[PDB]
RNA sequence: GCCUACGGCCACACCACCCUGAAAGUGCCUGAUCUCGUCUGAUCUCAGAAGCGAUACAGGGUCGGGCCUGGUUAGUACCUGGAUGGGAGACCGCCUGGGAAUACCAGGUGUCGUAGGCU
RNA sequence: UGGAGCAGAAGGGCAAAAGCUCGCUUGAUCUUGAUUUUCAGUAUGAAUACAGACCGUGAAAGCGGGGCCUCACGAUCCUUC
RNA sequence: CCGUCGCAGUUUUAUCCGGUAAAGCGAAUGAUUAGAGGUACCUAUUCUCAAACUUUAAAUGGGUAAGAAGCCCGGCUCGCUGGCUUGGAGCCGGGCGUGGAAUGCGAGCACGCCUAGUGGGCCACUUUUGGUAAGCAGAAC
């Protein structure tokens, strides 16, 4: 295919696979969660993200290659069931390609591939694991940067795993029955529902 | 090139608001529109008869003719360099009384009352509206407590 | 700009390096805001007047 | 299992109808065609006759629509007939004609048009339409608000209509829905209509029950016997009512009643009571464990 | 030998070259498109308006 | 209070024939002899090749009885069933029904002209006051503590007819 | 305090469930001779007043759903005008002004007019 | 709460409606002028609101001079009615 | 001359219009990831999106109004309107400038009458379409 230099910038409007854009091939990346996904929230407290710094288009080919490069290092350094990689960029923007060139007469091209439009400060790939595996996530996410264009920086989030709550408050909300784990994440329990649900918790 | 259809591009313009569908409320038909009053124009998709064109949506004009459940409006329409007084016929479901005109007629009723009440007392009151003047001088008490010191916060991720 | 060129005529500033006094109110400061790159105004004292 | 149709997203998108529609009282489709005045009339009142029949009472009103609500001009009820003689049977076609006649005579007495337009003092059940007199004030033009009733031949909404037209009201109508219109021959018989106006269809039923079974005659016409009303007295009872209505059509009410203003419903709980109720339930649940 | 299709680039300058002019507001605007039944009666109101000219002089004297 | 007594609102009989023609007009006379009233033909909603039915083609006949005649036809229907109904015959909405395989047991003598047909007896129960959800003026719901459940329907069948309900 | 008929605004009014309801009213309810309409007086129209508050209806309750209002998110995102600003670029900062919306949290939950009527 | 349908493409609109069914019908009729849209503010096409007739329908208020709205069409000359 | 008409590629005040940016999809349509609970679905959550999706929703922007062509008092005409001077519109007499936002400015005559040239454009900030891109092609200001 063409090099990623041709479809790196978000130059057109988002062109998703819809009833009007038919004939789109299947994306290269199909699995977004790797490792031990069916793990409790207390299993993997630490989480690290691959935050982007460019407003560009990451190809599904680069999303799959960076997924394998990060998985092959977490398996070799943290075991096959000691992490959970979640790719947080689904390729929805379809790329078009013109015919193998009467030159520009009817130049609207046919679908070529799919990219994921990333924003400045948006997470690309997230890895949660034990706290002592902090340096392994930084290196696993660093090796996957070379499989991506542009500039990305590795950030260790203050949240507890893949949840949206800080690690400092997570322990307190668990004791107060405000957070209950449901598989990979937790459910926020407000005080604004029927009281029967409150009796079931306690 | 685009099509010259009458309702081309009126997907959201003539559509009804969210949870505002159904039959038209009755007070819309109970409002009196005399000749010469300033009314707004806003097409309603519930009633397709007597529907104003997409150019007059959001426009304003005065009423010159009144018929059964329909009035005639003199609307200004700038085409290229000639603002044109258009005499259109729309039904009452697509018009509302301009509150700007009613707010001015109330200022006249008060101006005529103030200058009449001031003449009976001999005083002179003002009627001309004045823009927001620069704030006059004033004292600001600290209340004993010092002002809260602010400073830029450090950068976090 | 046409909007800037119209405000500069209402202030009688039709050429470079000319000055006119303006009675400051909300209807005037917003006119001075539409032409900030073209004007350099302030608050003159008595000696300046 | 089955998806909850009335889920959270159901009530978010759910647009309730009008209150009068949710209660099944106002037909808003026929209302805009009945109460809305032409825009070249400029606040000319468009009156209408509101005839409603409950299980025990017949409401006859005359109103015109306004933005702040309908303005009831005159109102006549079938429970006011005991003042004119009719004690029982306040929800029949003969009673509808009375409250309709009372509405037409009470309205004209309020506008002073009672001495100008009298309608048909003698009841014949035939087609009648009041005409305006030159030099005299115009006749009160009104329309019929039938409501949600199936307007078939014989509905009591056309009995009050006939009472209003005979009273002096100028209501456009026809003799097609009056009881006595043969749908096959397409002809209107006025003698059959006069029988329903004076309640002769009740007399033919009271006599038939006496000649068949007293046990059914007493079960069907208990209050007719309690008040002494017989079958041969029906036509003369309503005649004295039709005469007494035209004589004194004005309405008189009681001065006032000073009560203690006792509240009978339950007082709505405040915010402090709802919070404490939850805190007590939370304290009671953790205590039982 | 293609060319340009549509342009409104220099048109705003041409329109404002002489200024966008509104029609001069005239008292007693034209009564075109009014209700013909309304125009009939309004003509009769002016046709017989002199019929009460004597009552007008009598009422003005009372003031 | 007497305003909660379960009663028979209507008995709806159904004879769904596979096809129209002379086979269908015979079943119409069967309901006429039993219910004493003219039946109503039900056209097919859609077309089915396997069932051999075309759209808007009468395939069934149905009636409905309200007064004491509904209790008469139900008594003759429950007699053929030996006054016993399975527990699943009662719906959660308070109604129930059963099927008769031959109309000759209901009281209609067999004749060589018309064939033998099977009916579909369905009883719609109700309390006094269930008409508020059917009238046009001021229509309202029935209410939670007033609609018939499956338990009250089975108990009513075990009391008025003393029938046996199999598990 | 409450109920009718007609309404205006059309969820703060709806929905689920539970509790309570004087008096009148409303409704249920009782019948099919006439009016009228159905396969069937269930609906509809008509006739009536033995029965009760079961339901409808009204009021109240629910750490109720929704809805409504406000806070928060947030001067965040976005944006007018400006620069011989930065950067290979992608884009970003500043100047001049304008300024959001979810999640989250809190509060509220019909109201008004006309006429007649009950405590 | 329309998640169905409304002849068709799509959008909009629509629930005791504009959908479905039924019974009466021919406002899809005869006319004058004004107005809207494409516009040069010319024509055509298609629309809007009246008025004067003559009718339909409904108990009536009303509604209707084609299709729920946005497309579904044609100058001079000539022929024909 | 002040004053008053009249005027404006501009503000202010008052009041309308819109569905773009952004946002949302634990809200509808469409797309989409991973577990959990109850019994392949079903409930409660979770990841990522729309140009031909949207509950929300700007900035900029569009329309109107800011008086004598008015206000107030008293009458007249009508064949329209009609329970009733009841509307409506027109007309007549009398009374009342504090001209009833800021600023600038002379306007009007369908911006009169006749009228040449032009009807190959091109470029830049921003917005934006096709195209890998183009000293490319095509738009808005
Ligand atoms: Mg197109
Ligand atoms: Mg060219
Ligand atoms: Mg071309
Ligand atoms: Mg709640
Ligand atoms: Mg909020
Ligand atoms: Mg006509
Ligand atoms: Mg020229
Ligand atoms: Mg030329
Ligand atoms: Mg050339
Ligand atoms: Mg170019
Ligand atoms: Mg070129």
From TrEMBL, chain B:
The keyword Ribosomal protein applies. GO terms for molecular function: structural constituent of ribosome. One of its GO terms (biological process) is translation. Keywords: Ribonucleoprotein, Ribosomal protein. It comes from the Eukaryota. GO terms for cellular component: cytosolic large ribosomal subunit. The keyword Ribosomal protein applies. PANTHER family: 60S RIBOSOMAL PROTEIN L21 (PTHR20981). Belongs to the eukaryotic ribosomal protein eL21 family. This is Large ribosomal subunit protein eL21. It comes from Xenopus laevis (African clawed frog). The gene is MGC80700.
TrEMBL record, chain C:
It comes from Xenopus laevis. It is found in: Cytoplasm. The chain holds residues 100 to 148 of 246 of the full protein. Belongs to the universal ribosomal protein uL30 family. Component of the large ribosomal subunit. The ribosome is a large ribonucleoprotein complex responsible for the synthesis of proteins in the cell. Binds to G-rich structures in 28S rRNA and in mRNAs. Plays a regulatory role in the translation apparatus; inhibits cell-free translation of mRNAs. Transmembrane segments: none annotated. This is Large ribosomal subunit protein uL30. Residues 1-39 form the Large ribosomal subunit protein uL30-like ferredoxin-like fold domain.
Automatic annotation (TrEMBL), chain D:
Residues 269-279 have a biased composition (Basic and acidic residues). It is found in: Cytoplasm; Nucleus, Nucleolus. The gene is rpl5.L. Residues 253-266 have a biased composition (Basic residues). Its main location: cytoplasm. GO terms for biological process: ribosomal large subunit assembly; translation. PANTHER family: LARGE RIBOSOMAL SUBUNIT PROTEIN UL18, RIBOSOMAL PROTEIN L5-RELATED. It comes from the Eukaryota. Component of the large ribosomal subunit (LSU). Part of a LSU subcomplex, the 5S RNP which is composed of the 5S RNA, RPL5 and RPL11. Keywords: Cytoplasm, Nucleus, Ribonucleoprotein, Ribosomal protein, RNA-binding, rRNA-binding. Residues 234-287 form the Large ribosomal subunit protein uL18 C-terminal eukaryotes domain. GO terms for cellular component: cytosolic large ribosomal subunit; nucleolus. One of its GO terms (molecular function) is 5S rRNA binding. Belongs to the universal ribosomal protein uL18 family. Residues 246-289 are annotated as: Disordered. This is 60S ribosomal protein L5-B.
TrEMBL record, chain F:
GO terms for cellular component: ribonucleoprotein complex; ribosome. InterPro entries: Ribosomal_uL5, Ribosomal_uL5_C, Ribosomal_uL5_CS, Ribosomal_uL5_dom_sf, Ribosomal_uL5_euk/arc-type, Ribosomal_uL5_N. Belongs to the universal ribosomal protein uL5 family. This is Large ribosomal subunit protein uL5. One of its GO terms (molecular function) is rRNA binding. Residues 58-154 form the Large ribosomal subunit protein uL5 C-terminal domain. It holds the Pfam family Ribosomal_L5_C. GO terms for biological process: translation. NCBIfam families: PRK04219.1. Keywords: Ribonucleoprotein, Ribosomal protein, RNA-binding, rRNA-binding. PROSITE patterns: RIBOSOMAL_L5. Residues 1-54 form the Large ribosomal subunit protein uL5 N-terminal domain.
């Amino acid at each position: 295919r063409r090099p990623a230099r041709c479809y790196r910038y978000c130059k057109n409007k988002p062109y998703p696979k819809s009833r009007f854009c038919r004939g789109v091939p299947d994306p290269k990346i199909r699995i977004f969660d790797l490792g031990r996904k069916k793990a409790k929230v207390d299993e993997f407290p630490l989480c690290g993200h691959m935050v982007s710094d460019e407003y560009e288009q990451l190809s599904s080919e680069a999303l799959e290659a960076a997924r394998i490069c990060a998985n092959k290092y977490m398996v070799k350094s943290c075991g096959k069931d000691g992490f959970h990689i979640r790719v947080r960029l689904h390729p929805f923007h379809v790329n078009r390609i013109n015919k193998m060139l009467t030159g520009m007469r009817g130049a609207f091209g046919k679908p070529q591939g799919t990219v994921a439009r990333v924003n400045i400060g948006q997470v690309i790939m997230s890895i949660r694991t034990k706290t002592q595996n902090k340096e392994h996530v930084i290196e696993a996410l660093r090796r996957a940067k070379f499989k991506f264009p542009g500039r990305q920086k590795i950030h260790i989030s203050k949240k507890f795993g893949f949840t949206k709550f800080n690690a400092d408050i997570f322990e307190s909300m668990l004791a107060e029955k405000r957070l209950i784990p449901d598989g990979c994440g937790v459910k926020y329990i407000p005080n604004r529902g029927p009281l029967d649900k409150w009796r079931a918790i306690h | 090139t685009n099509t010259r259809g009458k309702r081309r591009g009126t997907r959201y313009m003539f559509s009804r608001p969210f949870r505002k569908h159904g039959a038209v409320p009755l007070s819309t038909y109970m409002r009196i529109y005399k000749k010469g009053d300033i009314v707004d124009i806003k097409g309603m998709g519930t009633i397709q008869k007597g529907m104003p064109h997409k150019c007059y949506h959001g426009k304003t004009g005065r009423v010159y003719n009144v018929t059964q459940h329909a009035v005639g409006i003199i609307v200004n329409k700038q085409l290229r360099g000639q603002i044109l007084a258009k005499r259109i016929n729309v039904r009452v479901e697509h018009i509302r009384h301009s509150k700007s005109r009613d707010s001015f007629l109330q200022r006249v009723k008060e101006n005529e009352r103030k200058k009449k009440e001031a003449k009976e007392k001999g005083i002179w009151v003002e009627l001309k509206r004045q823009p927001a003047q620069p704030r006059e001088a004033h004292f600001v008490r600290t209340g004993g407590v010092e002002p809260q010191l602010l400073e830029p916060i450090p950068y976090e991720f | 700009s046409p909007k800037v060129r119209k405000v500069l005529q209402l202030l009688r500033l039709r050429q470079i390096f000319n000055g006119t006094f303006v009675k400051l109110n909300k209807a005037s400061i917003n006119m001075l805001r539409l032409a900030e790159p073209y004007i350099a105004w302030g608050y003159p004292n008595l000696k300046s007047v | 299992f089955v998806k909850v149709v009335k889920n959270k997203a159901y009530f978010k998108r759910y647009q309730v109808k009008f209150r009068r529609r949710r209660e099944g009282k106002t037909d808003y489709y026929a209302r805009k065609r009945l109460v809305i005045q032409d825009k070249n009339k400029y606040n000319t009142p468009k009156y209408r006759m509101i005839v409603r029949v409950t299980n025990r009472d017949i409401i006859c009103q005359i109103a015109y629509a306004r933005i702040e609500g309908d303005m009831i001009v005159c109102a006549a009820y079938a429970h006011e007939l005991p003042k004119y003689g009719v004690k029982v049977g306040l929800t029949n076609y003969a009673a509808a004609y009375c409250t309709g006649l009372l509405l037409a005579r009470r309205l004209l007495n309020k506008f002073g048009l009672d001495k100008v337009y009298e309608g048909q003092v003698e009841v014949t059940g035939d087609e009648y339409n009041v005409e305006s007199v030159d030099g005299e004030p115009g006749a009160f033009t009104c329309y019929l608000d039938a409501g949600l009733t199936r307007t078939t031949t014989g509905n009591k909404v056309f009995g009050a209509l006939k009472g209003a037209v005979d009273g002096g009201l100028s209501i456009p109508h026809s003799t097609k829905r009056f009881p006595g219109y043969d749908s096959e021959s397409k002809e209107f018989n006025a003698e059959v209509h006069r029988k329903h106006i004076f309640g002769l269809n009740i007399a033919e039923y009271m006599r038939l029950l006496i000649e068949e079974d007293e046990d059914a005659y007493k079960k069907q016409f208990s209050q007719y016997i309690k008040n002494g009303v017989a079958a041969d007295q029906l036509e003369d009872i309503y005649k004295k009512a039709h005469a007494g209505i035209r004589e004194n059509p004005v309405h008189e009410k009681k001065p006032k009643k000073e009560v203690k203003k006792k509240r009978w419903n339950r007082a709505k709980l405040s915010l402090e009571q709802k919070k404490d109720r939850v805190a007590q339930k939370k304290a009671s649940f953790l205590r039982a464990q | 030998a293609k060319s340009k299709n549509h342009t409104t680039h220099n048109q705003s300058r041409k329109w404002h070259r002489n200024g966008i002019k509104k029609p001069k507001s005239q008292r007693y605007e034209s009564l075109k498109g009014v209700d013909p039944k309304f125009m009939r009666n309004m003509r009769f109101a002016k046709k017989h308006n002199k019929k009460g000219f004597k009552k007008m002089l009598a009422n003005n004297a009372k003031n | 209070n007497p305003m909660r007594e379960l009663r028979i609102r209507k008995l709806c009989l159904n004879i769904c024939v596979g096809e129209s023609g002379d086979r269908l007009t015979r079943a119409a006379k069967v309901l006429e002899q039993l219910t004493g009233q003219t039946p109503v033909f039900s056209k097919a909603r859609y077309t089915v090749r396997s069932f051999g039915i075309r759209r808007n083609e009468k395939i069934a006949v149905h009636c409905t009885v309200r007064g004491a005649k509904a209790e008469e036809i139900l008594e003759k229907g429950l007699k053929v069933r030996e006054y016993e109904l399975r527990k699943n015959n009662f719906s959660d909405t308070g109604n129930f029904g059963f099927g008769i395989q031959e109309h000759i047991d209901l009281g209609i003598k067999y004749d060589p002209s018309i064939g033998i047909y099977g009916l579909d007896f369905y009883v719609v129960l109700g309390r006094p006051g269930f008409s508020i959800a059917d009238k046009k003026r001021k229509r309202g719901v029935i209410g939670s503590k007033h609609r018939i459940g499956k338990e009250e329907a089975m108990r009513w069948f075990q009391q008025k007819y003393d029938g046996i309900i199999l598990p």
